[PDB]
Amino acid sequence: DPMVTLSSILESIINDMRDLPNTYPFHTPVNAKVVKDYYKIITRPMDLQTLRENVRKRLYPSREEFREHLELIVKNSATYNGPKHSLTQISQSMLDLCDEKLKEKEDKLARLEKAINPLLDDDDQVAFSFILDNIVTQKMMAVPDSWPFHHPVNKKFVPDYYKVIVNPMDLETIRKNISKHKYQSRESFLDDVNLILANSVKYNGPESQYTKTAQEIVNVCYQTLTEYDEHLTQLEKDICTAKEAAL
Ligand SMILES: C[C@@H]1COCCN1c1cc(C2(S(C)(=O)=O)CC2)nc(-c2cccc3[nH]ccc23)n1
């Protein structure tokens, strides 16, 4: 079972990260009854124990989902402790080692990932994802003053954001989803794109300039999808055939 082999590789990387110097503060979850403001600042807690348990729950079908959770450890430290704090440097040493090990095992990991999910090797899925990523970076992120929507909100800087917005979305998250080939057609992609605009209506109001910018992001997405409609329709058809074939 390639998921078992993959999981064993990921656990071995966790073992190697745990062994780096001074890493213990990251081995287990932050104790929010000692660090009483932790959840007022951090939205997505992560640590090596939780990461290992998730590997064992078979939550990571690829390098990328694993690495994304590992990177939260660093991002959270950068936010809470500071970008140059020794704890943030220590967390970064873990991520650097992970990247070394993933580099070394890249061909084996690719083989396992494609055995787990054959669409990662499908040329139509890859071409479709490439087009979506170019729409995001060249059209959507090029909208003037679109920066509020480029990344997840950092609760440190907007402390009530996630009390209001419980289903957040942003363009970086969409790009990460594209890189993982989460979207097999425009319908699921547009659900996430529209969530950006819905969240702006809710948090900022329907007449806010933030919402006008978000509306422009959505409108240039529709305009560009319409321009590429013929090609995208063919890719979506061939992806469906590949999806059904893998059965
Ligand atoms: C709430 C507002 C409008 O609705 C969309 C998301 N918005 C963001 C997003 C971000 C992020 S950030 C830096 O937190 O990563 C994702 C890019 N920051 C700020 C922000 C931060 C600090 C002071 C501020 N004054 C006005 C906006 C603002 N607002």
Side-chain angles (χ1 to χ4, degrees), residues 1-243 245-247:
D1 178 353
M3 271 295 305
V4 172
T5 308
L6 174 60
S7 292
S8 300
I9 295 171
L10 300 180
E11 289 207 58
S12 78
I13 295 174
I14 298 177
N15 294 338
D16 294 337
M17 313 180 284
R18 167 207 65 205
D19 290 344
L20 286 169
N22 292 347
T23 56
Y24 182 62
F26 300 111
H27 291 190
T28 65
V30 170
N31 183 347
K33 286 193 180 181
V34 170
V35 188
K36 291 179 178 181
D37 65 343
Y38 194 67
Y39 297 152
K40 289 177 196 72
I41 303 290
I42 297 303
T43 303
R44 298 181 63 196
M46 187 51 58
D47 67 275
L48 294 185
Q49 174 187 95
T50 299
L51 192 67
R52 185 191 298 281
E53 284 165 2
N54 288 351
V55 169
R56 285 169 182 191
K57 284 157 172 203
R58 304 311 183 229
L59 293 192
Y60 304 129
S62 72
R63 285 167 272 200
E64 184 50 26
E65 287 96 351
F66 171 83
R67 191 188 184 275
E68 287 168 11
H69 276 179
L70 171 62
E71 190 169 24
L72 294 171
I73 300 183
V74 182
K75 291 165 156 189
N76 290 343
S77 185
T79 294
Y80 190 84
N81 299 307
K84 315 285 220 152
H85 194 287
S86 68
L87 290 166
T88 306
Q89 299 191 57
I90 291 157
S91 70
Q92 184 68 48
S93 82
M94 318 194 289
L95 183 57
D96 293 341
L97 183 56
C98 172
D99 288 342
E100 178 164 296
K101 302 295 182 180
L102 296 182
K103 184 74 175 68
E104 294 172 1
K105 311 170 189 288
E106 64 200 329
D107 292 331
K108 184 198 297 199
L109 287 164
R111 287 176 204 272
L112 296 166
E113 283 168 1
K114 283 152 179 158
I116 293 158
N117 178 4
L119 283 188
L120 307 182
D121 198 30
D122 181 275
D123 307 304
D124 297 305
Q125 176 70 73
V126 168
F128 180 78
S129 291
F130 186 70
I131 294 169
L132 295 189
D133 194 63
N134 286 351
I135 297 178
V136 175
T137 60
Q138 310 299 120
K139 299 293 195 167
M140 290 165 86
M141 284 168 77
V143 168
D145 303 328
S146 57
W147 65 266
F149 309 107
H150 285 204
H151 303 280
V153 170
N154 191 324
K155 189 160 68 178
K156 187 177 193 185
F157 303 143
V158 191
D160 79 337
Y161 187 75
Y162 293 103
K163 295 183 184 295
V164 177
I165 300 304
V166 296
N167 285 132
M169 191 46 61
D170 66 275
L171 297 174
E172 184 202 330
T173 300
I174 294 180
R175 290 195 74 202
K176 281 181 191 335
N177 287 340
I178 293 164
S179 85
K180 292 177 285 188
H181 300 303
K182 176 214 172 173
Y183 308 114
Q184 278 71 67
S185 74
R186 280 163 280 190
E187 313 203 337
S188 51
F189 171 72
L190 284 172
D191 284 345
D192 285 349
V193 171
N194 271 280
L195 185 51
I196 299 177
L197 172 59
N199 290 338
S200 186
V201 169
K202 185 168 180 57
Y203 187 80
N204 301 306
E207 281 298 288
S208 169
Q209 178 59 56
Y210 290 137
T211 295
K212 291 174 198 312
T213 298
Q215 186 63 77
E216 196 179 342
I217 292 170
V218 168
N219 284 347
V220 305
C221 183
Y222 291 132
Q223 185 57 44
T224 311
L225 293 176
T226 300
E227 293 180 359
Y228 307 160
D229 175 60
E230 193 149 56
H231 189 194
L232 290 172
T233 294
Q234 186 58 234
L235 291 168
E236 290 168 346
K237 183 190 181 293
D238 288 334
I239 290 166
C240 199
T241 303
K243 207 196 163 48
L247 284 186

PDB file of all heavy atoms in Angstrom, residues 146-158 160-162 165 169-170 196 199-200 203-204 208 210-211 214, ligand 1:
ATOM      1  N   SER A 146      -5.285  44.508  -4.498  1.00  0.00           N
ATOM      2  CA  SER A 146      -5.827  43.219  -4.127  1.00  0.00           C
ATOM      3  C   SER A 146      -5.089  42.536  -2.976  1.00  0.00           C
ATOM      4  O   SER A 146      -5.546  41.483  -2.540  1.00  0.00           O
ATOM      5  CB  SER A 146      -5.865  42.283  -5.338  1.00  0.00           C
ATOM      6  OG  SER A 146      -4.612  42.108  -5.947  1.00  0.00           O
ATOM      7  N   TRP A 147      -4.049  43.157  -2.416  1.00  0.00           N
ATOM      8  CA  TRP A 147      -3.234  42.541  -1.375  1.00  0.00           C
ATOM      9  C   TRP A 147      -4.029  41.961  -0.206  1.00  0.00           C
ATOM     10  O   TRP A 147      -3.600  40.932   0.353  1.00  0.00           O
ATOM     11  CB  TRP A 147      -2.166  43.534  -0.855  1.00  0.00           C
ATOM     12  CG  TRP A 147      -2.740  44.723  -0.162  1.00  0.00           C
ATOM     13  CD1 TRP A 147      -3.030  45.944  -0.700  1.00  0.00           C
ATOM     14  CD2 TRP A 147      -3.089  44.800   1.222  1.00  0.00           C
ATOM     15  NE1 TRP A 147      -3.601  46.748   0.254  1.00  0.00           N
ATOM     16  CE2 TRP A 147      -3.621  46.085   1.441  1.00  0.00           C
ATOM     17  CE3 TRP A 147      -2.995  43.900   2.311  1.00  0.00           C
ATOM     18  CZ2 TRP A 147      -4.098  46.494   2.694  1.00  0.00           C
ATOM     19  CZ3 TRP A 147      -3.468  44.333   3.560  1.00  0.00           C
ATOM     20  CH2 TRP A 147      -4.034  45.577   3.722  1.00  0.00           C
ATOM     21  N   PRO A 148      -5.169  42.525   0.230  1.00  0.00           N
ATOM     22  CA  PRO A 148      -5.835  41.926   1.399  1.00  0.00           C
ATOM     23  C   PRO A 148      -6.252  40.506   1.165  1.00  0.00           C
ATOM     24  O   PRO A 148      -6.483  39.765   2.136  1.00  0.00           O
ATOM     25  CB  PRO A 148      -7.045  42.838   1.641  1.00  0.00           C
ATOM     26  CG  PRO A 148      -6.637  44.174   1.004  1.00  0.00           C
ATOM     27  CD  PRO A 148      -5.892  43.750  -0.215  1.00  0.00           C
ATOM     28  N   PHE A 149      -6.387  40.107  -0.096  1.00  0.00           N
ATOM     29  CA  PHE A 149      -6.901  38.817  -0.496  1.00  0.00           C
ATOM     30  C   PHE A 149      -5.805  37.880  -0.970  1.00  0.00           C
ATOM     31  O   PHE A 149      -6.117  36.739  -1.331  1.00  0.00           O
ATOM     32  CB  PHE A 149      -7.960  39.014  -1.599  1.00  0.00           C
ATOM     33  CG  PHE A 149      -8.993  40.016  -1.211  1.00  0.00           C
ATOM     34  CD1 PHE A 149      -9.053  41.297  -1.771  1.00  0.00           C
ATOM     35  CD2 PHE A 149      -9.930  39.698  -0.240  1.00  0.00           C
ATOM     36  CE1 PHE A 149      -9.991  42.214  -1.350  1.00  0.00           C
ATOM     37  CE2 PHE A 149     -10.883  40.616   0.162  1.00  0.00           C
ATOM     38  CZ  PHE A 149     -10.929  41.850  -0.368  1.00  0.00           C
ATOM     39  N   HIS A 150      -4.543  38.273  -0.881  1.00  0.00           N
ATOM     40  CA  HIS A 150      -3.506  37.419  -1.409  1.00  0.00           C
ATOM     41  C   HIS A 150      -3.111  36.297  -0.459  1.00  0.00           C
ATOM     42  O   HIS A 150      -2.516  35.333  -0.917  1.00  0.00           O
ATOM     43  CB  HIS A 150      -2.246  38.253  -1.708  1.00  0.00           C
ATOM     44  CG  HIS A 150      -2.343  39.108  -2.933  1.00  0.00           C
ATOM     45  ND1 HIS A 150      -1.222  39.526  -3.622  1.00  0.00           N
ATOM     46  CD2 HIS A 150      -3.407  39.593  -3.610  1.00  0.00           C
ATOM     47  CE1 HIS A 150      -1.610  40.242  -4.670  1.00  0.00           C
ATOM     48  NE2 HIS A 150      -2.934  40.286  -4.690  1.00  0.00           N
ATOM     49  N   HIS A 151      -3.383  36.421   0.830  1.00  0.00           N
ATOM     50  CA  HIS A 151      -2.878  35.496   1.841  1.00  0.00           C
ATOM     51  C   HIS A 151      -3.931  35.348   2.905  1.00  0.00           C
ATOM     52  O   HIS A 151      -4.795  36.222   3.046  1.00  0.00           O
ATOM     53  CB  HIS A 151      -1.589  35.973   2.512  1.00  0.00           C
ATOM     54  CG  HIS A 151      -0.490  36.224   1.563  1.00  0.00           C
ATOM     55  ND1 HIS A 151       0.285  35.208   1.041  1.00  0.00           N
ATOM     56  CD2 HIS A 151      -0.051  37.365   1.013  1.00  0.00           C
ATOM     57  CE1 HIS A 151       1.166  35.724   0.197  1.00  0.00           C
ATOM     58  NE2 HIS A 151       0.989  37.034   0.169  1.00  0.00           N
ATOM     59  N   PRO A 152      -3.869  34.288   3.714  1.00  0.00           N
ATOM     60  CA  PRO A 152      -4.767  34.206   4.868  1.00  0.00           C
ATOM     61  C   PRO A 152      -4.552  35.377   5.810  1.00  0.00           C
ATOM     62  O   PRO A 152      -3.421  35.836   6.009  1.00  0.00           O
ATOM     63  CB  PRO A 152      -4.371  32.886   5.558  1.00  0.00           C
ATOM     64  CG  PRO A 152      -3.566  32.151   4.574  1.00  0.00           C
ATOM     65  CD  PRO A 152      -2.964  33.156   3.636  1.00  0.00           C
ATOM     66  N   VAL A 153      -5.651  35.860   6.390  1.00  0.00           N
ATOM     67  CA  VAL A 153      -5.530  36.925   7.380  1.00  0.00           C
ATOM     68  C   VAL A 153      -4.734  36.411   8.568  1.00  0.00           C
ATOM     69  O   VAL A 153      -4.964  35.310   9.093  1.00  0.00           O
ATOM     70  CB  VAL A 153      -6.921  37.391   7.830  1.00  0.00           C
ATOM     71  CG1 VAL A 153      -6.844  38.288   9.007  1.00  0.00           C
ATOM     72  CG2 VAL A 153      -7.601  38.100   6.678  1.00  0.00           C
ATOM     73  N   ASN A 154      -3.823  37.238   9.057  1.00  0.00           N
ATOM     74  CA  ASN A 154      -3.087  36.933  10.271  1.00  0.00           C
ATOM     75  C   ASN A 154      -3.864  37.530  11.438  1.00  0.00           C
ATOM     76  O   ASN A 154      -4.010  38.742  11.549  1.00  0.00           O
ATOM     77  CB  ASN A 154      -1.674  37.515  10.240  1.00  0.00           C
ATOM     78  CG  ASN A 154      -0.833  36.987  11.353  1.00  0.00           C
ATOM     79  OD1 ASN A 154      -1.304  36.761  12.462  1.00  0.00           O
ATOM     80  ND2 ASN A 154       0.447  36.720  11.068  1.00  0.00           N
ATOM     81  N   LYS A 155      -4.400  36.671  12.302  1.00  0.00           N
ATOM     82  CA  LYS A 155      -5.203  37.099  13.434  1.00  0.00           C
ATOM     83  C   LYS A 155      -4.448  38.064  14.338  1.00  0.00           C
ATOM     84  O   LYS A 155      -5.064  38.832  15.050  1.00  0.00           O
ATOM     85  CB  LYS A 155      -5.692  35.831  14.181  1.00  0.00           C
ATOM     86  CG  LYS A 155      -6.735  36.128  15.258  1.00  0.00           C
ATOM     87  CD  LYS A 155      -7.527  34.855  15.618  1.00  0.00           C
ATOM     88  CE  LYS A 155      -6.631  33.952  16.277  1.00  0.00           C
ATOM     89  NZ  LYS A 155      -7.441  32.688  16.674  1.00  0.00           N
ATOM     90  N   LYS A 156      -3.113  38.039  14.358  1.00  0.00           N
ATOM     91  CA  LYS A 156      -2.408  39.010  15.180  1.00  0.00           C
ATOM     92  C   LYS A 156      -2.743  40.431  14.749  1.00  0.00           C
ATOM     93  O   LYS A 156      -2.766  41.361  15.575  1.00  0.00           O
ATOM     94  CB  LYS A 156      -0.905  38.782  15.097  1.00  0.00           C
ATOM     95  CG  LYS A 156      -0.090  39.627  16.044  1.00  0.00           C
ATOM     96  CD  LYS A 156       1.394  39.293  15.946  1.00  0.00           C
ATOM     97  CE  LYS A 156       2.175  39.884  17.087  1.00  0.00           C
ATOM     98  NZ  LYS A 156       3.625  39.611  16.854  1.00  0.00           N
ATOM     99  N   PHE A 157      -2.912  40.618  13.461  1.00  0.00           N
ATOM    100  CA  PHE A 157      -3.136  41.943  12.907  1.00  0.00           C
ATOM    101  C   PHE A 157      -4.592  42.305  12.745  1.00  0.00           C
ATOM    102  O   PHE A 157      -4.923  43.498  12.658  1.00  0.00           O
ATOM    103  CB  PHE A 157      -2.468  42.067  11.538  1.00  0.00           C
ATOM    104  CG  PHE A 157      -0.993  41.797  11.552  1.00  0.00           C
ATOM    105  CD1 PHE A 157      -0.412  41.125  10.481  1.00  0.00           C
ATOM    106  CD2 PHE A 157      -0.179  42.206  12.593  1.00  0.00           C
ATOM    107  CE1 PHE A 157       0.955  40.844  10.489  1.00  0.00           C
ATOM    108  CE2 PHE A 157       1.211  41.931  12.607  1.00  0.00           C
ATOM    109  CZ  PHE A 157       1.750  41.233  11.532  1.00  0.00           C
ATOM    110  N   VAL A 158      -5.475  41.318  12.682  1.00  0.00           N
ATOM    111  CA  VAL A 158      -6.917  41.516  12.571  1.00  0.00           C
ATOM    112  C   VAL A 158      -7.581  40.607  13.618  1.00  0.00           C
ATOM    113  O   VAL A 158      -8.059  39.499  13.313  1.00  0.00           O
ATOM    114  CB  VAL A 158      -7.425  41.233  11.158  1.00  0.00           C
ATOM    115  CG1 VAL A 158      -8.891  41.716  11.015  1.00  0.00           C
ATOM    116  CG2 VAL A 158      -6.534  41.884  10.072  1.00  0.00           C
ATOM    117  N   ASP A 160     -10.269  40.037  15.386  1.00  0.00           N
ATOM    118  CA  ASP A 160     -11.617  39.477  15.356  1.00  0.00           C
ATOM    119  C   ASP A 160     -11.989  38.831  14.026  1.00  0.00           C
ATOM    120  O   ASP A 160     -13.127  38.359  13.869  1.00  0.00           O
ATOM    121  CB  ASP A 160     -12.652  40.558  15.676  1.00  0.00           C
ATOM    122  CG  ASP A 160     -12.939  41.462  14.483  1.00  0.00           C
ATOM    123  OD1 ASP A 160     -12.089  41.550  13.590  1.00  0.00           O
ATOM    124  OD2 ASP A 160     -14.017  42.110  14.464  1.00  0.00           O
ATOM    125  N   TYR A 161     -11.039  38.661  13.104  1.00  0.00           N
ATOM    126  CA  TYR A 161     -11.401  38.243  11.759  1.00  0.00           C
ATOM    127  C   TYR A 161     -12.089  36.880  11.747  1.00  0.00           C
ATOM    128  O   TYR A 161     -13.097  36.663  11.044  1.00  0.00           O
ATOM    129  CB  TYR A 161     -10.185  38.202  10.844  1.00  0.00           C
ATOM    130  CG  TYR A 161     -10.552  37.935   9.409  1.00  0.00           C
ATOM    131  CD1 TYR A 161     -11.110  38.920   8.643  1.00  0.00           C
ATOM    132  CD2 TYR A 161     -10.412  36.661   8.861  1.00  0.00           C
ATOM    133  CE1 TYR A 161     -11.503  38.668   7.337  1.00  0.00           C
ATOM    134  CE2 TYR A 161     -10.752  36.413   7.540  1.00  0.00           C
ATOM    135  CZ  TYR A 161     -11.308  37.434   6.813  1.00  0.00           C
ATOM    136  OH  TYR A 161     -11.679  37.141   5.506  1.00  0.00           O
ATOM    137  N   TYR A 162     -11.536  35.917  12.470  1.00  0.00           N
ATOM    138  CA  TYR A 162     -12.016  34.544  12.394  1.00  0.00           C
ATOM    139  C   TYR A 162     -13.183  34.269  13.319  1.00  0.00           C
ATOM    140  O   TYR A 162     -13.783  33.193  13.222  1.00  0.00           O
ATOM    141  CB  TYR A 162     -10.864  33.563  12.695  1.00  0.00           C
ATOM    142  CG  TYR A 162      -9.821  33.623  11.597  1.00  0.00           C
ATOM    143  CD1 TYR A 162      -8.599  34.318  11.783  1.00  0.00           C
ATOM    144  CD2 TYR A 162     -10.010  33.013  10.382  1.00  0.00           C
ATOM    145  CE1 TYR A 162      -7.664  34.391  10.772  1.00  0.00           C
ATOM    146  CE2 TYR A 162      -9.084  33.075   9.382  1.00  0.00           C
ATOM    147  CZ  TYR A 162      -7.884  33.748   9.598  1.00  0.00           C
ATOM    148  OH  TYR A 162      -6.966  33.766   8.586  1.00  0.00           O
ATOM    149  N   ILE A 165     -15.466  35.412  10.263  1.00  0.00           N
ATOM    150  CA  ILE A 165     -15.261  34.591   9.080  1.00  0.00           C
ATOM    151  C   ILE A 165     -14.814  33.204   9.528  1.00  0.00           C
ATOM    152  O   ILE A 165     -13.634  32.974   9.837  1.00  0.00           O
ATOM    153  CB  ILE A 165     -14.236  35.237   8.140  1.00  0.00           C
ATOM    154  CG1 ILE A 165     -14.744  36.624   7.715  1.00  0.00           C
ATOM    155  CG2 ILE A 165     -13.926  34.293   6.962  1.00  0.00           C
ATOM    156  CD1 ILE A 165     -16.123  36.618   7.075  1.00  0.00           C
ATOM    157  N   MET A 169     -10.998  32.055   3.037  1.00  0.00           N
ATOM    158  CA  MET A 169     -10.346  31.712   1.787  1.00  0.00           C
ATOM    159  C   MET A 169      -9.562  32.912   1.282  1.00  0.00           C
ATOM    160  O   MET A 169      -9.895  34.079   1.556  1.00  0.00           O
ATOM    161  CB  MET A 169     -11.404  31.317   0.743  1.00  0.00           C
ATOM    162  CG  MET A 169     -10.899  30.676  -0.546  1.00  0.00           C
ATOM    163  SD  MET A 169      -9.681  29.370  -0.354  1.00  0.00           S
ATOM    164  CE  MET A 169     -10.616  28.180   0.619  1.00  0.00           C
ATOM    165  N   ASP A 170      -8.520  32.614   0.525  1.00  0.00           N
ATOM    166  CA  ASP A 170      -7.636  33.644  -0.004  1.00  0.00           C
ATOM    167  C   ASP A 170      -6.932  33.067  -1.225  1.00  0.00           C
ATOM    168  O   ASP A 170      -6.982  31.860  -1.488  1.00  0.00           O
ATOM    169  CB  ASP A 170      -6.622  34.054   1.058  1.00  0.00           C
ATOM    170  CG  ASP A 170      -5.706  32.929   1.381  1.00  0.00           C
ATOM    171  OD1 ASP A 170      -6.083  32.078   2.233  1.00  0.00           O
ATOM    172  OD2 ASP A 170      -4.661  32.779   0.712  1.00  0.00           O
ATOM    173  N   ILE A 196     -13.998  34.079  -1.309  1.00  0.00           N
ATOM    174  CA  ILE A 196     -13.259  35.305  -1.026  1.00  0.00           C
ATOM    175  C   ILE A 196     -14.194  36.503  -1.031  1.00  0.00           C
ATOM    176  O   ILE A 196     -14.187  37.332  -0.125  1.00  0.00           O
ATOM    177  CB  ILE A 196     -12.109  35.481  -2.028  1.00  0.00           C
ATOM    178  CG1 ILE A 196     -11.136  34.327  -1.931  1.00  0.00           C
ATOM    179  CG2 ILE A 196     -11.393  36.767  -1.750  1.00  0.00           C
ATOM    180  CD1 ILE A 196      -9.993  34.349  -2.919  1.00  0.00           C
ATOM    181  N   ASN A 199     -16.813  36.381   1.875  1.00  0.00           N
ATOM    182  CA  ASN A 199     -16.233  36.762   3.140  1.00  0.00           C
ATOM    183  C   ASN A 199     -15.987  38.264   3.217  1.00  0.00           C
ATOM    184  O   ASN A 199     -16.037  38.836   4.310  1.00  0.00           O
ATOM    185  CB  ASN A 199     -14.947  35.997   3.378  1.00  0.00           C
ATOM    186  CG  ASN A 199     -15.237  34.522   3.637  1.00  0.00           C
ATOM    187  OD1 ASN A 199     -16.328  34.159   4.029  1.00  0.00           O
ATOM    188  ND2 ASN A 199     -14.238  33.698   3.438  1.00  0.00           N
ATOM    189  N   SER A 200     -15.652  38.911   2.097  1.00  0.00           N
ATOM    190  CA  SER A 200     -15.498  40.365   2.147  1.00  0.00           C
ATOM    191  C   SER A 200     -16.821  41.072   2.373  1.00  0.00           C
ATOM    192  O   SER A 200     -16.898  42.033   3.145  1.00  0.00           O
ATOM    193  CB  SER A 200     -14.852  40.878   0.854  1.00  0.00           C
ATOM    194  OG  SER A 200     -14.580  42.259   0.938  1.00  0.00           O
ATOM    195  N   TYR A 203     -17.443  40.555   6.191  1.00  0.00           N
ATOM    196  CA  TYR A 203     -16.535  41.200   7.154  1.00  0.00           C
ATOM    197  C   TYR A 203     -16.469  42.711   6.926  1.00  0.00           C
ATOM    198  O   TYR A 203     -16.487  43.491   7.876  1.00  0.00           O
ATOM    199  CB  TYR A 203     -15.111  40.590   7.102  1.00  0.00           C
ATOM    200  CG  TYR A 203     -14.251  41.139   8.210  1.00  0.00           C
ATOM    201  CD1 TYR A 203     -14.361  40.637   9.503  1.00  0.00           C
ATOM    202  CD2 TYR A 203     -13.395  42.191   8.004  1.00  0.00           C
ATOM    203  CE1 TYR A 203     -13.655  41.174  10.540  1.00  0.00           C
ATOM    204  CE2 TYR A 203     -12.652  42.732   9.035  1.00  0.00           C
ATOM    205  CZ  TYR A 203     -12.780  42.230  10.305  1.00  0.00           C
ATOM    206  OH  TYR A 203     -12.072  42.766  11.369  1.00  0.00           O
ATOM    207  N   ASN A 204     -16.438  43.132   5.674  1.00  0.00           N
ATOM    208  CA  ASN A 204     -16.220  44.529   5.326  1.00  0.00           C
ATOM    209  C   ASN A 204     -17.490  45.257   4.942  1.00  0.00           C
ATOM    210  O   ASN A 204     -17.527  46.491   5.033  1.00  0.00           O
ATOM    211  CB  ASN A 204     -15.251  44.612   4.166  1.00  0.00           C
ATOM    212  CG  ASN A 204     -13.917  43.984   4.471  1.00  0.00           C
ATOM    213  OD1 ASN A 204     -13.281  44.340   5.472  1.00  0.00           O
ATOM    214  ND2 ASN A 204     -13.474  43.054   3.635  1.00  0.00           N
ATOM    215  N   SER A 208     -18.041  48.370   0.814  1.00  0.00           N
ATOM    216  CA  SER A 208     -16.646  48.658   1.154  1.00  0.00           C
ATOM    217  C   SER A 208     -15.789  48.680  -0.100  1.00  0.00           C
ATOM    218  O   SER A 208     -16.019  47.915  -1.039  1.00  0.00           O
ATOM    219  CB  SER A 208     -16.149  47.573   2.122  1.00  0.00           C
ATOM    220  OG  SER A 208     -14.722  47.544   2.368  1.00  0.00           O
ATOM    221  N   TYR A 210     -12.933  47.342  -0.031  1.00  0.00           N
ATOM    222  CA  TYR A 210     -12.396  45.976  -0.038  1.00  0.00           C
ATOM    223  C   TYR A 210     -13.300  45.065  -0.850  1.00  0.00           C
ATOM    224  O   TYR A 210     -12.832  44.251  -1.647  1.00  0.00           O
ATOM    225  CB  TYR A 210     -12.250  45.456   1.403  1.00  0.00           C
ATOM    226  CG  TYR A 210     -11.151  46.143   2.155  1.00  0.00           C
ATOM    227  CD1 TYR A 210     -11.341  46.548   3.453  1.00  0.00           C
ATOM    228  CD2 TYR A 210      -9.896  46.305   1.583  1.00  0.00           C
ATOM    229  CE1 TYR A 210     -10.321  47.227   4.150  1.00  0.00           C
ATOM    230  CE2 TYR A 210      -8.878  46.972   2.269  1.00  0.00           C
ATOM    231  CZ  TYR A 210      -9.111  47.384   3.551  1.00  0.00           C
ATOM    232  OH  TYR A 210      -8.075  48.078   4.234  1.00  0.00           O
ATOM    233  N   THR A 211     -14.610  45.233  -0.697  1.00  0.00           N
ATOM    234  CA  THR A 211     -15.517  44.377  -1.451  1.00  0.00           C
ATOM    235  C   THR A 211     -15.541  44.720  -2.931  1.00  0.00           C
ATOM    236  O   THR A 211     -15.602  43.810  -3.769  1.00  0.00           O
ATOM    237  CB  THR A 211     -16.913  44.450  -0.847  1.00  0.00           C
ATOM    238  OG1 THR A 211     -16.813  43.884   0.471  1.00  0.00           O
ATOM    239  CG2 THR A 211     -17.926  43.638  -1.652  1.00  0.00           C
ATOM    240  N   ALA A 214     -12.612  42.870  -4.193  1.00  0.00           N
ATOM    241  CA  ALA A 214     -12.906  41.456  -4.297  1.00  0.00           C
ATOM    242  C   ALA A 214     -13.830  41.168  -5.488  1.00  0.00           C
ATOM    243  O   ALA A 214     -13.684  40.135  -6.153  1.00  0.00           O
ATOM    244  CB  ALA A 214     -13.556  40.936  -3.011  1.00  0.00           C
TER     245      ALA A 214
HETATM  246  C1  LIG B   1      -9.615  42.686   6.982  1.00  0.00           C
HETATM  247  C2  LIG B   1      -9.075  43.107   5.611  1.00  0.00           C
HETATM  248  C3  LIG B   1     -10.235  43.323   4.603  1.00  0.00           C
HETATM  249  O1  LIG B   1     -10.864  42.066   4.266  1.00  0.00           O
HETATM  250  C4  LIG B   1      -9.948  41.250   3.549  1.00  0.00           C
HETATM  251  C5  LIG B   1      -8.755  40.905   4.477  1.00  0.00           C
HETATM  252  N1  LIG B   1      -8.154  42.108   5.044  1.00  0.00           N
HETATM  253  C6  LIG B   1      -6.835  42.102   5.460  1.00  0.00           C
HETATM  254  C7  LIG B   1      -5.929  41.060   5.154  1.00  0.00           C
HETATM  255  C8  LIG B   1      -4.621  41.155   5.619  1.00  0.00           C
HETATM  256  C9  LIG B   1      -3.585  40.125   5.310  1.00  0.00           C
HETATM  257  S1  LIG B   1      -2.377  39.864   6.601  1.00  0.00           S
HETATM  258  C10 LIG B   1      -1.296  41.299   6.628  1.00  0.00           C
HETATM  259  O2  LIG B   1      -3.094  39.793   7.938  1.00  0.00           O
HETATM  260  O3  LIG B   1      -1.574  38.685   6.164  1.00  0.00           O
HETATM  261  C11 LIG B   1      -3.880  38.889   4.472  1.00  0.00           C
HETATM  262  C12 LIG B   1      -3.042  40.024   3.887  1.00  0.00           C
HETATM  263  N2  LIG B   1      -4.255  42.222   6.389  1.00  0.00           N
HETATM  264  C13 LIG B   1      -5.130  43.209   6.689  1.00  0.00           C
HETATM  265  C14 LIG B   1      -4.758  44.285   7.513  1.00  0.00           C
HETATM  266  C15 LIG B   1      -3.789  44.084   8.492  1.00  0.00           C
HETATM  267  C16 LIG B   1      -3.371  45.108   9.393  1.00  0.00           C
HETATM  268  C17 LIG B   1      -3.999  46.368   9.324  1.00  0.00           C
HETATM  269  C18 LIG B   1      -4.981  46.584   8.352  1.00  0.00           C
HETATM  270  N3  LIG B   1      -5.709  47.675   8.060  1.00  0.00           N
HETATM  271  C19 LIG B   1      -6.529  47.437   7.039  1.00  0.00           C
HETATM  272  C20 LIG B   1      -6.357  46.123   6.616  1.00  0.00           C
HETATM  273  C21 LIG B   1      -5.378  45.577   7.435  1.00  0.00           C
HETATM  274  N4  LIG B   1      -6.403  43.124   6.235  1.00  0.00           N
END
